[PDB]
PDB file of N, CA and C in Angstrom:
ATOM      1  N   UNK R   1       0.845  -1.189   0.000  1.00  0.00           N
ATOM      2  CA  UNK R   1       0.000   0.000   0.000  1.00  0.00           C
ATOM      3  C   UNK R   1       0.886   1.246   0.000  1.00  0.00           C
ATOM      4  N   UNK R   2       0.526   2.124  -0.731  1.00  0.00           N
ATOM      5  CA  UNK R   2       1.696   3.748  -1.021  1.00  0.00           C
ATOM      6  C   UNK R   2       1.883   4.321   0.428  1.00  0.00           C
ATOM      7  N   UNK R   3       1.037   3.923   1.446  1.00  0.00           N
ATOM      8  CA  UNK R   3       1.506   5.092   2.639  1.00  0.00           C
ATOM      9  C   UNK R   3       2.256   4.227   3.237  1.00  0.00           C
ATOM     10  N   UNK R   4       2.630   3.272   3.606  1.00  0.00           N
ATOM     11  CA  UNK R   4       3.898   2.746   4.386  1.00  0.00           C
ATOM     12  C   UNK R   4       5.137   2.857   3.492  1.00  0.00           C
ATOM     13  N   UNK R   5       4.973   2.352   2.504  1.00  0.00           N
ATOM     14  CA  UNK R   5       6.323   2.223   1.537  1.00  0.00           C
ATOM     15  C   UNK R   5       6.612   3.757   1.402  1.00  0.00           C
ATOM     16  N   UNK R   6       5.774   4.666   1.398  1.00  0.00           N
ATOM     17  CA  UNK R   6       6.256   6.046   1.185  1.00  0.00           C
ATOM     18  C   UNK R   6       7.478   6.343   2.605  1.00  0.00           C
ATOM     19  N   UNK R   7       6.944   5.875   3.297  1.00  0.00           N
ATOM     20  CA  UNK R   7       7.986   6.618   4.444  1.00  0.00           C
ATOM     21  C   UNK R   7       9.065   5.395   4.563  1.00  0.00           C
ATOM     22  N   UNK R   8       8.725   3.818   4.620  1.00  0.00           N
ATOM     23  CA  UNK R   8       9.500   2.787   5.320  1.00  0.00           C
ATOM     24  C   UNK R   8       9.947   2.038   3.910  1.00  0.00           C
ATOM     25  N   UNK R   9      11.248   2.216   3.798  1.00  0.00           N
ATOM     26  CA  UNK R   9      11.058   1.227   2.387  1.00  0.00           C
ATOM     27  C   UNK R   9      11.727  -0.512   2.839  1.00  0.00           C
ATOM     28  N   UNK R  10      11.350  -1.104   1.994  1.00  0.00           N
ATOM     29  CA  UNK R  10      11.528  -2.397   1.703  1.00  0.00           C
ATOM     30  C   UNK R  10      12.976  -3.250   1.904  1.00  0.00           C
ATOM     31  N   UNK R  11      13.136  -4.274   3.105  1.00  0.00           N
ATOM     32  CA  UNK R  11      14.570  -4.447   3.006  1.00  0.00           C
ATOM     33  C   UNK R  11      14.350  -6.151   3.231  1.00  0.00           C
ATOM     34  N   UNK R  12      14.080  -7.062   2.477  1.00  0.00           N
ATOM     35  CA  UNK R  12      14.092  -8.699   2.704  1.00  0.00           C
ATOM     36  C   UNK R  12      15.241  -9.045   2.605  1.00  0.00           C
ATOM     37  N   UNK R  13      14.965  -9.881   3.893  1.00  0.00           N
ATOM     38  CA  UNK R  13      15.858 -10.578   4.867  1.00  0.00           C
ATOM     39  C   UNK R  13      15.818 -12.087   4.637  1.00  0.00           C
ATOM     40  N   UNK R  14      16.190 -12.933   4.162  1.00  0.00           N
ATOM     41  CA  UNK R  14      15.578 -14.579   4.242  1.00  0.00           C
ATOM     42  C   UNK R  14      15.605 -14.836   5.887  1.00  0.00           C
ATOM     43  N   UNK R  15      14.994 -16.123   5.796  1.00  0.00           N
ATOM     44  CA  UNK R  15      14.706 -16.543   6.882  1.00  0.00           C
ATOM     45  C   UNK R  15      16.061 -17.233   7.631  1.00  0.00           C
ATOM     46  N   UNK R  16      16.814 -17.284   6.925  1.00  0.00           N
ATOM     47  CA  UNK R  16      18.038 -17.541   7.713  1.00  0.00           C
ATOM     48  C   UNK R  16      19.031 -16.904   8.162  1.00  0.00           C
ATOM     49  N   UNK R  17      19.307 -15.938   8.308  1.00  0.00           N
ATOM     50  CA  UNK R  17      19.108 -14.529   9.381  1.00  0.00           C
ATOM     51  C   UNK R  17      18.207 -14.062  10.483  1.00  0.00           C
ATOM     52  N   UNK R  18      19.262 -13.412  11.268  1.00  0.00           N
ATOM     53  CA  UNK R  18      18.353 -12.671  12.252  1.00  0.00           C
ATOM     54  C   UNK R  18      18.237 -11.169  12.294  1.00  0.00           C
ATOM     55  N   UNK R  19      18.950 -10.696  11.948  1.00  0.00           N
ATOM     56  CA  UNK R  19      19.195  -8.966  12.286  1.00  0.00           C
ATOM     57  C   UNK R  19      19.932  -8.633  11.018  1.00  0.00           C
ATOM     58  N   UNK R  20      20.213  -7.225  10.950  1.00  0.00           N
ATOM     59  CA  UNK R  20      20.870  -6.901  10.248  1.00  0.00           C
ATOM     60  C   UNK R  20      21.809  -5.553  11.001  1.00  0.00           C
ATOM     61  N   UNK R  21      23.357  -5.532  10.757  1.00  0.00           N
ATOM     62  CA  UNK R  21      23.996  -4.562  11.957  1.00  0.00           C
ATOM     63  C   UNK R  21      24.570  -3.578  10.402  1.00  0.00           C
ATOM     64  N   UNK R  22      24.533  -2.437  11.219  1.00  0.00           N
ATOM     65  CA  UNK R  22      25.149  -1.475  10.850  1.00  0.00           C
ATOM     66  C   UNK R  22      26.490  -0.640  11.096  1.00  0.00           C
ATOM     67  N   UNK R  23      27.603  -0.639   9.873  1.00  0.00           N
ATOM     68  CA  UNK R  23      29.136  -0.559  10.304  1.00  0.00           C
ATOM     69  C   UNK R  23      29.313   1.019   9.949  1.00  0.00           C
ATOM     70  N   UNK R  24      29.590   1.902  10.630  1.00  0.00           N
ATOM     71  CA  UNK R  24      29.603   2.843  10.871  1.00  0.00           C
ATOM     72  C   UNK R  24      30.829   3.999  10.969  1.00  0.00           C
ATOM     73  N   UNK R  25      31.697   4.092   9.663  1.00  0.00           N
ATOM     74  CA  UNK R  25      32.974   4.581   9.645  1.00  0.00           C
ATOM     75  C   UNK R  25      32.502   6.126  10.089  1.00  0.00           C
ATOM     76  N   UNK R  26      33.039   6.750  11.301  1.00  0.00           N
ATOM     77  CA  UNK R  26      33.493   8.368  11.944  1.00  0.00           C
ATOM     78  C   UNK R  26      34.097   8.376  12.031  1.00  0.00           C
ATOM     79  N   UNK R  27      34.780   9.918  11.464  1.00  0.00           N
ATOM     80  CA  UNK R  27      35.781  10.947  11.275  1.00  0.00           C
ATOM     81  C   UNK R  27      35.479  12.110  12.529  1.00  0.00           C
ATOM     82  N   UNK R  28      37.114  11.500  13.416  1.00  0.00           N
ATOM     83  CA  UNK R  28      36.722  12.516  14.562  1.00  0.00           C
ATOM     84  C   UNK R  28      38.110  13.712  14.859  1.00  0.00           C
ATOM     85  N   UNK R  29      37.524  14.567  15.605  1.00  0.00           N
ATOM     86  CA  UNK R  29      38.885  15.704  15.920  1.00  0.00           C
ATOM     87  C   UNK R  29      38.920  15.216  17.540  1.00  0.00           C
ATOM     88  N   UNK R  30      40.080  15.900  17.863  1.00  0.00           N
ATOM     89  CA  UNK R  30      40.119  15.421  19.508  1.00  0.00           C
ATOM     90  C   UNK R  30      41.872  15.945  19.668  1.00  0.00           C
ATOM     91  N   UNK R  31      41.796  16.711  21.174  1.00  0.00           N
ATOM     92  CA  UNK R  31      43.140  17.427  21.580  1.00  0.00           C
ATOM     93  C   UNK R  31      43.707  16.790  22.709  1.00  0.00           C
ATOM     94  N   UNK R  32      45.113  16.278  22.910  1.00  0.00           N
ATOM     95  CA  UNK R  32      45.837  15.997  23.658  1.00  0.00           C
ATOM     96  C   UNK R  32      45.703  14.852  24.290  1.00  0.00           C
ATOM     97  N   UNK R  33      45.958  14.120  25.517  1.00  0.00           N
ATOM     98  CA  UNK R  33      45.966  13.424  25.839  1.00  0.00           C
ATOM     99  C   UNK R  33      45.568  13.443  27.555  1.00  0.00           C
ATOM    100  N   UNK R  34      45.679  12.599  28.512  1.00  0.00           N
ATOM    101  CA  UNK R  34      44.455  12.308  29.752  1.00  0.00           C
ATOM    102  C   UNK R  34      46.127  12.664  30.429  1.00  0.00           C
ATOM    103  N   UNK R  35      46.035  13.928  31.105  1.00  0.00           N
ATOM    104  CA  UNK R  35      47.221  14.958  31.605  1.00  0.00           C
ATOM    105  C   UNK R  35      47.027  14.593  33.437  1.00  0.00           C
ATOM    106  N   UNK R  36      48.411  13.946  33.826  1.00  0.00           N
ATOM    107  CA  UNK R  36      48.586  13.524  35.308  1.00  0.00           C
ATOM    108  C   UNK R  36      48.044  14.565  35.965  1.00  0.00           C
ATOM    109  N   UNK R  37      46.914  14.410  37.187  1.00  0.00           N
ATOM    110  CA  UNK R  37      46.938  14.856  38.097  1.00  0.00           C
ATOM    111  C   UNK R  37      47.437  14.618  39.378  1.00  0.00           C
ATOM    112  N   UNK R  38      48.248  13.465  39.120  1.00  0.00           N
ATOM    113  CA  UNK R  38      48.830  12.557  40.141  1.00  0.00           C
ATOM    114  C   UNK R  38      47.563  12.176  41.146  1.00  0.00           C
ATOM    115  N   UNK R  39      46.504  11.551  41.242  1.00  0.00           N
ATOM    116  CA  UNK R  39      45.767  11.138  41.534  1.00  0.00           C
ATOM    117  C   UNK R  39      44.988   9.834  41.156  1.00  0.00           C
ATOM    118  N   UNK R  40      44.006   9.504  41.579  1.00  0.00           N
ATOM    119  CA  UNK R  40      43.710   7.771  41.246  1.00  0.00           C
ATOM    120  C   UNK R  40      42.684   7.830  40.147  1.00  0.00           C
ATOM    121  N   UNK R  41      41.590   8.677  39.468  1.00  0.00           N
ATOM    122  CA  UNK R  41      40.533   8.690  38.810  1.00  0.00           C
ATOM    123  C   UNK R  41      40.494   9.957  37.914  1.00  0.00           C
ATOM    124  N   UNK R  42      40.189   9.435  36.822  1.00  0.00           N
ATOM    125  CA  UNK R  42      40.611  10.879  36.153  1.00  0.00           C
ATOM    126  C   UNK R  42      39.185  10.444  34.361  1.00  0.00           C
ATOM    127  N   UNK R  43      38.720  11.675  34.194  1.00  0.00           N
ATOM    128  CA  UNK R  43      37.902  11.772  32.979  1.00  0.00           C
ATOM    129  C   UNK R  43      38.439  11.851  31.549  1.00  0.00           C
ATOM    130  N   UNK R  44      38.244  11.610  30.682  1.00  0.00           N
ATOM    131  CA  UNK R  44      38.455  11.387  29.435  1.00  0.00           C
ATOM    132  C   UNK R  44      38.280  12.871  28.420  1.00  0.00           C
ATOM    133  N   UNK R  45      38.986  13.039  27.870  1.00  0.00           N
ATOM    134  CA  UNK R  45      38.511  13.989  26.978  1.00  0.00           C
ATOM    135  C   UNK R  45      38.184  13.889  25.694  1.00  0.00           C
ATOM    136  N   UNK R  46      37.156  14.888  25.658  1.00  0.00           N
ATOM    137  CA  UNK R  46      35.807  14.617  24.818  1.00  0.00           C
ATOM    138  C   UNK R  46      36.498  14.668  23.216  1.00  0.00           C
ATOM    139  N   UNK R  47      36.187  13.084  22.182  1.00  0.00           N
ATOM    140  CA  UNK R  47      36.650  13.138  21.329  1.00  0.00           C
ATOM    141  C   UNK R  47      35.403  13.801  20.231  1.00  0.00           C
ATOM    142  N   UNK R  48      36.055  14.912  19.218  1.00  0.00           N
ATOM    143  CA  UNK R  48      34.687  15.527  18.938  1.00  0.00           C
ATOM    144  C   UNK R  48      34.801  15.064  17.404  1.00  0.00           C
ATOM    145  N   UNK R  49      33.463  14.931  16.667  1.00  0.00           N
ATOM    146  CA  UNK R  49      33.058  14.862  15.695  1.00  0.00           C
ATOM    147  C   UNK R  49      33.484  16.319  14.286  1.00  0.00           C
ATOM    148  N   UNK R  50      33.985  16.090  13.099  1.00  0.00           N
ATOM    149  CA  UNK R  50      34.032  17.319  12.420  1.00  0.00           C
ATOM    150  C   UNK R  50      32.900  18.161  11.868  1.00  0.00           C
ATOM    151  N   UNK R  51      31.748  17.303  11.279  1.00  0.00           N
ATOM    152  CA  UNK R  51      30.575  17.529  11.224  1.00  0.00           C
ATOM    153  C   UNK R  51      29.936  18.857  11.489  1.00  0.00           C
ATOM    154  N   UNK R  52      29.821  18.838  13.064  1.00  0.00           N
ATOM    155  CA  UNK R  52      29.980  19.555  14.326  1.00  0.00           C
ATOM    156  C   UNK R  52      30.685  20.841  14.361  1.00  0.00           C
TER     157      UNK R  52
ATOM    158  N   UNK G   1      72.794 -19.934  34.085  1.00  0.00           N
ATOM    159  CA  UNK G   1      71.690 -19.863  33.973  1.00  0.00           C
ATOM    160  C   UNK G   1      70.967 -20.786  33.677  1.00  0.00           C
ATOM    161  N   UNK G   2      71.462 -21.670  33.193  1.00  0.00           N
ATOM    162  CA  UNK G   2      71.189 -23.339  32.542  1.00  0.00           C
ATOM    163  C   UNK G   2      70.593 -23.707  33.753  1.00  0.00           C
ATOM    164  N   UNK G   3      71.403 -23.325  35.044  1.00  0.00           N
ATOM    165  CA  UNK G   3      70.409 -24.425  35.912  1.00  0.00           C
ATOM    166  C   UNK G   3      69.834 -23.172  37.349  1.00  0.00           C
ATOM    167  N   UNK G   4      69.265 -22.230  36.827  1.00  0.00           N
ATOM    168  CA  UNK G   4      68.141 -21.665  37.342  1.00  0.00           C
ATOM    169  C   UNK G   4      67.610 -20.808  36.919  1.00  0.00           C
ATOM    170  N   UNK G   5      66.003 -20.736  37.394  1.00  0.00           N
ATOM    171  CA  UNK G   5      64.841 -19.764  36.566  1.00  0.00           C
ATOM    172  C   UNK G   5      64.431 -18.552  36.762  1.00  0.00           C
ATOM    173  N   UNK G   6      65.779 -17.787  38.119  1.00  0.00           N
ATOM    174  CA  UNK G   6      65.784 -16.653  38.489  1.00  0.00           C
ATOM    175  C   UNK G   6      67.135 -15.703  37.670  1.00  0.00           C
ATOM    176  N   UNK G   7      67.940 -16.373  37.131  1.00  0.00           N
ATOM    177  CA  UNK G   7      68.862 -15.781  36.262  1.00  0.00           C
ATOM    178  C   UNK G   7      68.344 -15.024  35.155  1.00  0.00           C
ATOM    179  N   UNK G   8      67.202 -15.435  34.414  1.00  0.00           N
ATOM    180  CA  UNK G   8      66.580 -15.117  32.913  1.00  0.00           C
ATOM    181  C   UNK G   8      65.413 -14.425  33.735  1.00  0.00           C
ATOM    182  N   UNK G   9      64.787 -13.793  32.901  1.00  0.00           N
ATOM    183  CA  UNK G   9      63.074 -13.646  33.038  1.00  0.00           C
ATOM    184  C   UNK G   9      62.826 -12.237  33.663  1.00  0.00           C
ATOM    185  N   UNK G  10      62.065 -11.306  33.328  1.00  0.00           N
ATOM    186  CA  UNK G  10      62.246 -10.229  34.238  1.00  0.00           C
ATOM    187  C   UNK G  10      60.922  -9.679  33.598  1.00  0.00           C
ATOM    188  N   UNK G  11      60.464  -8.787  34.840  1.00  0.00           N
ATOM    189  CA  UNK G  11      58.771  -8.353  33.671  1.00  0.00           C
ATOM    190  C   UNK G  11      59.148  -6.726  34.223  1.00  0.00           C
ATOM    191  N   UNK G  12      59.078  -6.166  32.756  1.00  0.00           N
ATOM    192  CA  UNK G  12      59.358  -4.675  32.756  1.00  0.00           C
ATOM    193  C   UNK G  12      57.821  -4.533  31.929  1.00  0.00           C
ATOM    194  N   UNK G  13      56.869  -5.133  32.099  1.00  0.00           N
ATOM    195  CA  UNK G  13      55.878  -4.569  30.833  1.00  0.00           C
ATOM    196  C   UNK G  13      54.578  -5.075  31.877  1.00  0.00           C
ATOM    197  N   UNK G  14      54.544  -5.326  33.046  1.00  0.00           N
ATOM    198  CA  UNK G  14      53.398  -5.958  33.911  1.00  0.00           C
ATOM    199  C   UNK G  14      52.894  -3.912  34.121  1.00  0.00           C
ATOM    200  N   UNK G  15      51.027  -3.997  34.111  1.00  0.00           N
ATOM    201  CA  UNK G  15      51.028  -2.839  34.675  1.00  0.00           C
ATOM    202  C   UNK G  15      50.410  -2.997  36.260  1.00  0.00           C
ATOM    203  N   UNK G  16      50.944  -3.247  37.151  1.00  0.00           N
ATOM    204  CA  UNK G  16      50.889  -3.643  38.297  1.00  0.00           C
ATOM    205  C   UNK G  16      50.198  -2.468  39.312  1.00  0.00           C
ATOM    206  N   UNK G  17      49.348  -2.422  39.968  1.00  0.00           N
ATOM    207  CA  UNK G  17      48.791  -1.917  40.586  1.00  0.00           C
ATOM    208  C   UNK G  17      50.147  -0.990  41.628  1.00  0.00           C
ATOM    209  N   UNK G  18      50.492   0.481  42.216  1.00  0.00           N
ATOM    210  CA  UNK G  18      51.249   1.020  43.037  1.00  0.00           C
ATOM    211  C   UNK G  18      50.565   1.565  44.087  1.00  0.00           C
ATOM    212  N   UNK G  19      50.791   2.290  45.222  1.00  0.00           N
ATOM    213  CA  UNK G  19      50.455   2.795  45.936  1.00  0.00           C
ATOM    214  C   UNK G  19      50.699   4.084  46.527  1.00  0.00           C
ATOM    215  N   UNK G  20      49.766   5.260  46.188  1.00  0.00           N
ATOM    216  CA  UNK G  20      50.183   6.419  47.146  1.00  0.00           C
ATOM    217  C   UNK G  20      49.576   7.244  47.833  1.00  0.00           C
ATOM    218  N   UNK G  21      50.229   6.965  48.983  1.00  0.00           N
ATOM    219  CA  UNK G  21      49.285   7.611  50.582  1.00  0.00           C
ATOM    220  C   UNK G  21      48.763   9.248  49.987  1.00  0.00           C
ATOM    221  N   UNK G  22      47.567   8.923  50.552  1.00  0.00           N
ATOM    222  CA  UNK G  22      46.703  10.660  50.171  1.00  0.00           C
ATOM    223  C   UNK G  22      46.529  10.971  48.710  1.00  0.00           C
ATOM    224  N   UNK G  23      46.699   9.598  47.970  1.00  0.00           N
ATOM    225  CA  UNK G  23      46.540   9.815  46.357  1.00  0.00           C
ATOM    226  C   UNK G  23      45.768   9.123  45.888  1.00  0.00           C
ATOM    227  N   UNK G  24      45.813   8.074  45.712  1.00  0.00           N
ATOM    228  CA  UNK G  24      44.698   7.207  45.083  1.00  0.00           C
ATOM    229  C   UNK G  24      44.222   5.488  46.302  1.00  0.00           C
ATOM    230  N   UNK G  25      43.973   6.386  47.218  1.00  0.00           N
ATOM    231  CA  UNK G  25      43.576   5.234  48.584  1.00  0.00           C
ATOM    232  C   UNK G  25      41.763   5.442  48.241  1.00  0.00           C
ATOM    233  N   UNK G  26      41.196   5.869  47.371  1.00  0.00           N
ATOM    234  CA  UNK G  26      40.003   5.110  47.457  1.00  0.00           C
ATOM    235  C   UNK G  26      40.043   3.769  46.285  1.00  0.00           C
ATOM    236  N   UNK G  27      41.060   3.906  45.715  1.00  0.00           N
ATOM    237  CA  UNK G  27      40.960   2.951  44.486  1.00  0.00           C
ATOM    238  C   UNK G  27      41.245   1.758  45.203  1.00  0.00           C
ATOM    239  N   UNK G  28      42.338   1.447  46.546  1.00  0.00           N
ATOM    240  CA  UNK G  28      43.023  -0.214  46.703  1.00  0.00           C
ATOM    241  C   UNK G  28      41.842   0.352  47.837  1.00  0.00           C
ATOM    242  N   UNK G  29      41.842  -1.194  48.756  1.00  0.00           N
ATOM    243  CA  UNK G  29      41.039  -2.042  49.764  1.00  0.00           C
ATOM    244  C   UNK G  29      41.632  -0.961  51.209  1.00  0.00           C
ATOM    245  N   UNK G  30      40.794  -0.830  51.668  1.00  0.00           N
ATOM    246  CA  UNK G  30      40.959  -0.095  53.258  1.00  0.00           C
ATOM    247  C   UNK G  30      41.943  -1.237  53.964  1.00  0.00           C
ATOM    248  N   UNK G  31      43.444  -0.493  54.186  1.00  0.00           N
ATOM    249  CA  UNK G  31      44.350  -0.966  54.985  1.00  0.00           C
ATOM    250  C   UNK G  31      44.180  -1.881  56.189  1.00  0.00           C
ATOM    251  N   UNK G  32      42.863  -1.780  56.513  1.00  0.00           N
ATOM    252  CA  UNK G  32      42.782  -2.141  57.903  1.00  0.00           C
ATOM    253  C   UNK G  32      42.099  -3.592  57.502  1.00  0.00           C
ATOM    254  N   UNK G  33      42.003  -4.506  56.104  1.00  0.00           N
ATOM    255  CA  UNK G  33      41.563  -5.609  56.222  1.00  0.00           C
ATOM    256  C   UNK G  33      43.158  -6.382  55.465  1.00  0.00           C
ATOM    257  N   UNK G  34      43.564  -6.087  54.922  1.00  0.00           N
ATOM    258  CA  UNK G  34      45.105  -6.507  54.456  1.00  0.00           C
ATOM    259  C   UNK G  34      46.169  -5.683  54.216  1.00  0.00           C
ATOM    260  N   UNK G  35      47.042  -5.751  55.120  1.00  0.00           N
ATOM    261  CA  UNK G  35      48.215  -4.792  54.863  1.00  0.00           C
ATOM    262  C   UNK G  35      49.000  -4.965  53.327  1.00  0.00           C
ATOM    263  N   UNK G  36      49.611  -4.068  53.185  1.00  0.00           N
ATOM    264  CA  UNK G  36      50.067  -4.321  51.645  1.00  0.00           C
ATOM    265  C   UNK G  36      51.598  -5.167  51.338  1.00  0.00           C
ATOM    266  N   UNK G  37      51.495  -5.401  50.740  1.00  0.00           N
ATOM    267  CA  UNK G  37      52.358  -6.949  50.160  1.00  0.00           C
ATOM    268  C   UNK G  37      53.337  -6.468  49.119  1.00  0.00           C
ATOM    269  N   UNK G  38      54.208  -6.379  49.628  1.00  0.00           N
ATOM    270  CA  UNK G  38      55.736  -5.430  48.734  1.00  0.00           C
ATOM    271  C   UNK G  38      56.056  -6.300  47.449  1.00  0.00           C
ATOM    272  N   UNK G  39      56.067  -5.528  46.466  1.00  0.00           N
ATOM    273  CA  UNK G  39      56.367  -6.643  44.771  1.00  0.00           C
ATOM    274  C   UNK G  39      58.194  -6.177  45.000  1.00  0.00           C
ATOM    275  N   UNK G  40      58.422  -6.851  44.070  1.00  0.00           N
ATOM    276  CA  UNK G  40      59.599  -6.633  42.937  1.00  0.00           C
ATOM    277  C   UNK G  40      59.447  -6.311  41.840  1.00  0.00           C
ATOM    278  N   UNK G  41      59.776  -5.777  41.085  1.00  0.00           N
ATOM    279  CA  UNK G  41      59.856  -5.090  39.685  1.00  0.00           C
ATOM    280  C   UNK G  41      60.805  -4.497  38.993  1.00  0.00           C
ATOM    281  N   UNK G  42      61.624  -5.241  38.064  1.00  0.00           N
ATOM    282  CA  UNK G  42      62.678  -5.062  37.766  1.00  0.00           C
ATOM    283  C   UNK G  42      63.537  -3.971  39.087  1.00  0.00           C
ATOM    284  N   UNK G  43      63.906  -3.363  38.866  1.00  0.00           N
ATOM    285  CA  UNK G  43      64.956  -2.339  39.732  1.00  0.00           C
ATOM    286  C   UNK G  43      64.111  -1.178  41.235  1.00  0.00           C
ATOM    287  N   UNK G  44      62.305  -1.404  40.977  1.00  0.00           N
ATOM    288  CA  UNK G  44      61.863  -0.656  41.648  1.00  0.00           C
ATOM    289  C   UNK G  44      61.402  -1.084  42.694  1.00  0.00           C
ATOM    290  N   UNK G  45      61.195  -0.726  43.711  1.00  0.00           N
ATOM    291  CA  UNK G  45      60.329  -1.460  45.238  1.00  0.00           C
ATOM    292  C   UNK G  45      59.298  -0.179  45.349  1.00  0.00           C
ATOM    293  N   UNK G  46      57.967  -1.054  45.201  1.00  0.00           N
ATOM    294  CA  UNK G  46      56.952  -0.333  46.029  1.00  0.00           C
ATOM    295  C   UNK G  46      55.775  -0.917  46.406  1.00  0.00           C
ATOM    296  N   UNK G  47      54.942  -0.711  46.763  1.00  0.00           N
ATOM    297  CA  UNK G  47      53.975  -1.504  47.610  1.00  0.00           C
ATOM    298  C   UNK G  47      52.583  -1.396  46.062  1.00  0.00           C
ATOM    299  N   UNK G  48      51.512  -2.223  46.646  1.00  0.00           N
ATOM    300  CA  UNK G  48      50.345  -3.154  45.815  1.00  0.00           C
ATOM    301  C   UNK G  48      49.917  -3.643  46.760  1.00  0.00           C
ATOM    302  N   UNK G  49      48.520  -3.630  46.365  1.00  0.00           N
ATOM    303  CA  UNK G  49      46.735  -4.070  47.234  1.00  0.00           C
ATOM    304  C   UNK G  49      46.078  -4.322  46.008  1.00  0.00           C
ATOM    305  N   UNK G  50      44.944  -5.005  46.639  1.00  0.00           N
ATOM    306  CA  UNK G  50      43.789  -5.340  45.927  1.00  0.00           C
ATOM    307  C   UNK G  50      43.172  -4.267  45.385  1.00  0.00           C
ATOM    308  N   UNK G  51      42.278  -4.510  44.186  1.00  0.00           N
ATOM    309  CA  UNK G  51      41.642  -2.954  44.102  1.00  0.00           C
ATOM    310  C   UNK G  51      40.252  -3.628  44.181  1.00  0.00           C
ATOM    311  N   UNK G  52      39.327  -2.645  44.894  1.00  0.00           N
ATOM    312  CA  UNK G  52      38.183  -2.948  45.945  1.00  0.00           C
ATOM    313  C   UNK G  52      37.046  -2.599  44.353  1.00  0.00           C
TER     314      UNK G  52
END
Protein backbone atom coordinates (compact mmCIF):
# COMPACT_ATOMS: atom_id res chain seq x y z
CA UNK A 1 0.00 0.00 0.00
CA UNK A 2 1.70 3.75 -1.02
CA UNK A 3 1.51 5.09 2.64
CA UNK A 4 3.90 2.75 4.39
CA UNK A 5 6.32 2.22 1.54
CA UNK A 6 6.26 6.05 1.19
CA UNK A 7 7.99 6.62 4.44
CA UNK A 8 9.50 2.79 5.32
CA UNK A 9 11.06 1.23 2.39
CA UNK A 10 11.53 -2.40 1.70
CA UNK A 11 14.57 -4.45 3.01
CA UNK A 12 14.09 -8.70 2.70
CA UNK A 13 15.86 -10.58 4.87
CA UNK A 14 15.58 -14.58 4.24
CA UNK A 15 14.71 -16.54 6.88
CA UNK A 16 18.04 -17.54 7.71
CA UNK A 17 19.11 -14.53 9.38
CA UNK A 18 18.35 -12.67 12.25
CA UNK A 19 19.20 -8.97 12.29
CA UNK A 20 20.87 -6.90 10.25
CA UNK A 21 24.00 -4.56 11.96
CA UNK A 22 25.15 -1.47 10.85
CA UNK A 23 29.14 -0.56 10.30
CA UNK A 24 29.60 2.84 10.87
CA UNK A 25 32.97 4.58 9.64
CA UNK A 26 33.49 8.37 11.94
CA UNK A 27 35.78 10.95 11.27
CA UNK A 28 36.72 12.52 14.56
CA UNK A 29 38.89 15.70 15.92
CA UNK A 30 40.12 15.42 19.51
CA UNK A 31 43.14 17.43 21.58
CA UNK A 32 45.84 16.00 23.66
CA UNK A 33 45.97 13.42 25.84
CA UNK A 34 44.45 12.31 29.75
CA UNK A 35 47.22 14.96 31.60
CA UNK A 36 48.59 13.52 35.31
CA UNK A 37 46.94 14.86 38.10
CA UNK A 38 48.83 12.56 40.14
CA UNK A 39 45.77 11.14 41.53
CA UNK A 40 43.71 7.77 41.25
CA UNK A 41 40.53 8.69 38.81
CA UNK A 42 40.61 10.88 36.15
CA UNK A 43 37.90 11.77 32.98
CA UNK A 44 38.45 11.39 29.44
CA UNK A 45 38.51 13.99 26.98
CA UNK A 46 35.81 14.62 24.82
CA UNK A 47 36.65 13.14 21.33
CA UNK A 48 34.69 15.53 18.94
CA UNK A 49 33.06 14.86 15.69
CA UNK A 50 34.03 17.32 12.42
CA UNK A 51 30.58 17.53 11.22
CA UNK A 52 29.98 19.55 14.33
CA UNK B 1 71.69 -19.86 33.97
CA UNK B 2 71.19 -23.34 32.54
CA UNK B 3 70.41 -24.43 35.91
CA UNK B 4 68.14 -21.66 37.34
CA UNK B 5 64.84 -19.76 36.57
CA UNK B 6 65.78 -16.65 38.49
CA UNK B 7 68.86 -15.78 36.26
CA UNK B 8 66.58 -15.12 32.91
CA UNK B 9 63.07 -13.65 33.04
CA UNK B 10 62.25 -10.23 34.24
CA UNK B 11 58.77 -8.35 33.67
CA UNK B 12 59.36 -4.67 32.76
CA UNK B 13 55.88 -4.57 30.83
CA UNK B 14 53.40 -5.96 33.91
CA UNK B 15 51.03 -2.84 34.67
CA UNK B 16 50.89 -3.64 38.30
CA UNK B 17 48.79 -1.92 40.59
CA UNK B 18 51.25 1.02 43.04
CA UNK B 19 50.46 2.80 45.94
CA UNK B 20 50.18 6.42 47.15
CA UNK B 21 49.28 7.61 50.58
CA UNK B 22 46.70 10.66 50.17
CA UNK B 23 46.54 9.82 46.36
CA UNK B 24 44.70 7.21 45.08
CA UNK B 25 43.58 5.23 48.58
CA UNK B 26 40.00 5.11 47.46
CA UNK B 27 40.96 2.95 44.49
CA UNK B 28 43.02 -0.21 46.70
CA UNK B 29 41.04 -2.04 49.76
CA UNK B 30 40.96 -0.09 53.26
CA UNK B 31 44.35 -0.97 54.99
CA UNK B 32 42.78 -2.14 57.90
CA UNK B 33 41.56 -5.61 56.22
CA UNK B 34 45.11 -6.51 54.46
CA UNK B 35 48.22 -4.79 54.86
CA UNK B 36 50.07 -4.32 51.64
CA UNK B 37 52.36 -6.95 50.16
CA UNK B 38 55.74 -5.43 48.73
CA UNK B 39 56.37 -6.64 44.77
CA UNK B 40 59.60 -6.63 42.94
CA UNK B 41 59.86 -5.09 39.69
CA UNK B 42 62.68 -5.06 37.77
CA UNK B 43 64.96 -2.34 39.73
CA UNK B 44 61.86 -0.66 41.65
CA UNK B 45 60.33 -1.46 45.24
CA UNK B 46 56.95 -0.33 46.03
CA UNK B 47 53.97 -1.50 47.61
CA UNK B 48 50.34 -3.15 45.81
CA UNK B 49 46.74 -4.07 47.23
CA UNK B 50 43.79 -5.34 45.93
CA UNK B 51 41.64 -2.95 44.10
CA UNK B 52 38.18 -2.95 45.95
Amino acid sequence: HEFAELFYRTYIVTPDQAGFQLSIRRNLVWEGWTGEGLSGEKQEISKRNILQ
Amino acid sequence: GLLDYTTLETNSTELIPVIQSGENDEQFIDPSVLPAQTVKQGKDTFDTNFLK
